[PDB]
Amino acid sequence: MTEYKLVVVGACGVGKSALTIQLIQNHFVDEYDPTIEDSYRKQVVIDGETCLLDILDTAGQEEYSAMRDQYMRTGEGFLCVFAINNTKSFEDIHHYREQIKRVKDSEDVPMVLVGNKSDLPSRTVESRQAQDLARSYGIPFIETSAKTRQGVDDAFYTLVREIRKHKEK
């Protein structure tokens, strides 16, 4: 059974945690303990091929800025997350991708752009802006909602598809 080492990156106050938590946790249990091992591992079926997702989310450690390279090098694919109510977090994505390209030492690293919607304030990054940015990098854009759990599966599953497309090519 193939295992996919995924890594979540982005600014703080983005909902990086909520994205990964909502993937992992059962659809109708609002509960989580990040200390146990099932916290970051999920068996899933994507395009009829069973696989194991290993998600690294280091949310809360953004101030340890010199540890990003270390954490990033563990990944095969990356979710670059911004918040649709925080323009700065969207403008930061360029740096994260450039850092990922440097760590992995590759121009095409499996990658998806994710715009997360939690609660107020209101949207400042229109989906068109993100679709355009994603197109310039040659990667998928997925928009997700922390409240409703919409988009969460699609975001991770798309990354897995990008990893599979990269491994043939």
Binding site: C12, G13, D57, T58, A66, M67, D69, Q70
Partner: protein, 462 residues
């Protein structure tokens, strides 16, 4: 054989327990045989915080560490004053007997529990009072209101603690301080290779131990180090992290600015020796400073440098790298087995508190009514409790104030911004060891002193 309380109309806390106002975890408390509260209304949480049947130290500590998300300090004080002022039940049709029992088994115990909450609040979470002087006014006029002869000594003890709070040497012999090329007093020559690697590690362990020990639960609860007021609310945590980052960057800088290959091998070797003694001291923050520098993109790619590193030191580094692997599996186990003094890596606690607060709801709902999810807060309080258990034991090591100063005032970035500096380090990496197929250039030596390390073993016996 129950007490018969007042009606809820007159005294809110007499409202009986139900599924709509309090619920419990299925297991009983450690050491004590008390129910573990899962969730309740703020009225019920305060009832149990000041319960008549027994004292609950665990619940008190957990409540006063975490209450501020669901209840304001001013509100908490109003509620415990309301709790304290217990009216007696109205007579049935006549008249003691049940009235004297009520005074003995309901009023007096509850009043003492309220005083214990005030004592614990004032002792361990005095920052509430420092930030809201009116809160302290209300507390003092309330504490001055308490008359009971049995209450007197608890009241007087609370007053004592308030006055103390209004105003802000080794056990065994520490080892001898180690010197290499730089002599004592000559701070002008101090550098990575000229200071003794043992003493670099010791003095960084003292700095990083102090930084670790200064961080309080008030900087962590509510995930406040990630919010817009992080500099206001979490200054000591941020100072701790900025030092860690500073030194990682300094290690990277020392490596990539040493352009001569032979000298860069000496620089990397010495950093691995510092890691060796960080590991001897259980300074895991220190261990990860080095490992982060070594896995940074400017250093990681230097295959010609790591080729000439002695095999023994490769394995030291590789072992340290493996701590971080598989979501800190080896680090977690190693920290749990070792005993103080130590300096743990804070980042894991940060993520776990954040994910706990993000991954569980603030409230639970039962029969349409809204209960405060207390088990969430207990889990955060367990993590902050684990942080505190490693803050009590200091290191048996002498401070060397000039070496201390050197590492405090370290500033490898200079006036450059983060992106600018990490680009500079990476461009330096490409200069000194170009990308294949480009040939490896030679660079002249920059160190006029000897490169040979004095090793990681104390020079004299004691």
């Amino acid at each position: 054989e129950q007490m018969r309380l007042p009606s809820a109309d007159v005294y809110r806390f007499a409202e009986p327990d139900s599924e709509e106002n309090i619920i419990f975890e299925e297991n009983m408390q450690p050491k004590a045989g008390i129910p573990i509260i899962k969730a309740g209304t703020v009225i019920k949480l305060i009832e149990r915080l000041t319960y008549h049947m027994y004292a609950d130290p665990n619940f008190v500590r957990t409540f006063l560490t975490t209450y501020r998300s669901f209840c304001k300090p001013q509100e908490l004080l109003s509620l415990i004053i309301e709790r304290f002022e217990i009216p007696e039940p109205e007579p049935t049709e006549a008249d003691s007997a049940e009235l004297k029992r009520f005074r003995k088994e309901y009023i007096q115990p509850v009043q003492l529990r309220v005083l214990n909450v005030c004592r614990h609040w004032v002792e361990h979470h005095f920052y509430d009072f420092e930030r809201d002087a009116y809160l302290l006014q209300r507390m003092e006029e309330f504490i001055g209101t308490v008359r009971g002869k049995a209450m007197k000594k608890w009241v007087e003890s609370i007053t004592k603690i308030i006055q103390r709070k209004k105003i802000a040497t080794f056990q065994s012999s520490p080892p001898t301080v180690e010197w290499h090329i730089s002599r004592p007093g000559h701070i002008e020559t101090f550098d990575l290779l000229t200071l003794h690697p043992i003493e670099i590690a010791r003095q960084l362990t003292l700095l990083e131990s102090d930084l670790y020990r200064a961080v309080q639960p008030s900087e962590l609860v509510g995930s406040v180090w990630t919010k817009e007021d992080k500099e206001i609310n979490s200054p000591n945590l941020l100072k701790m992290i900025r030092h860690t980052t500073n030194l990682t960057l300094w290690f990277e800088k020392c490596i990539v600015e040493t352009e001569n290959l032979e000298e860069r091998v000496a620089v990397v070797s010495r950093i691995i020796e510092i890691l060796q003694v960080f590991q001897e001291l259980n300074n895991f923050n220190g261990v990860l400073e080095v490992v982060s520098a070594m896995n940074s993109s400017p250093v990681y790619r230097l295959d010609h440098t790591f080729e000439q590193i002695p095999s023994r030191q490769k394995k030291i580094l590789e072992e340290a790298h493996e701590l971080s692997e598989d979501h800190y599996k080896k680090y977690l186990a190693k920290l749990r087995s070792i005993n103080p003094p130590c300096v743990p890596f804070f980042g894991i606690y940060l993520t776990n508190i954040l994910k706990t607060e993000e991954g569980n709801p603030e409230v639970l709902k039962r029969h349409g009514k809204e209960l405060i999810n207390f088990s969430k807060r207990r889990k955060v309080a367990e993590i902050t409790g684990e942080i505190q258990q490693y803050q009590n034991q200091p290191y048996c090591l002498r401070v060397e104030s000039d070496i201390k100063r050197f590492f405090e005032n370290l500033n490898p970035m200079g006036n450059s911004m983060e992106k600018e500096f990490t680009d500079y380090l990476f461009n330096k990496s490409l200069e000194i060891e170009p990308r294949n197929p480009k040939p490896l250039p030679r660079f002249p030596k920059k160190y006029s002193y000897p490169l040979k390390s004095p090793g990681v073993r104390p020079s004299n016996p004691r």
